[PDB]
Amino acid sequence: RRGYWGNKIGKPHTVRCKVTGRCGSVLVRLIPAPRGTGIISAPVPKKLLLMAGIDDCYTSAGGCTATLGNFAKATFDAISKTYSYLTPDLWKETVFTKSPYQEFTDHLVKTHT
RNA sequence: UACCUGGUUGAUCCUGCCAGUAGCAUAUGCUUGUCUCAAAGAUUAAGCCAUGCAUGUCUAAGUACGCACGGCCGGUACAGU
16 A cells, blocks of 8 residues: 655555564564655665555664565565554445355355365 | 665574775875866974065155255245255
């Protein structure tokens, strides 16, 4: 989930909110950034964030980032939390639409599992 | 540009320092066409010093008998310089 800096002009360029993600003494602090600053990070998370389409970000690390297996999994952990972070936009209540499992069950009553 | 990478082990995750990285100002090595700007015996010995120079000054208007120059003849405030 991508978001904006402090104002709108369409097409989100950065992270919605300031989030973290930890994997066994490594953590990352993805901080939002204004347009055109580029991704300011180490080489390892610069891969992931660039592929994500998050084109602007400030970061900072803490702990042993030498063992990169932790470092990248902790980045990926942070990138997950974006839709698991509650924002005032999402406060309006969902309509609880029926599941595809329910509606399309008619074709699956043959022998299908 | 709010950034990290290598090194303790058979292998893994930490703690931790060492090394790598960029700027700045002094010395030094090697090299060097053209253009502008210019810091420069402070670091150490506020150690010691040859020679040369670096503070003098007169307007119509303080004092002109320089045997100076000049004079158009002088002085009688008395010339001009």
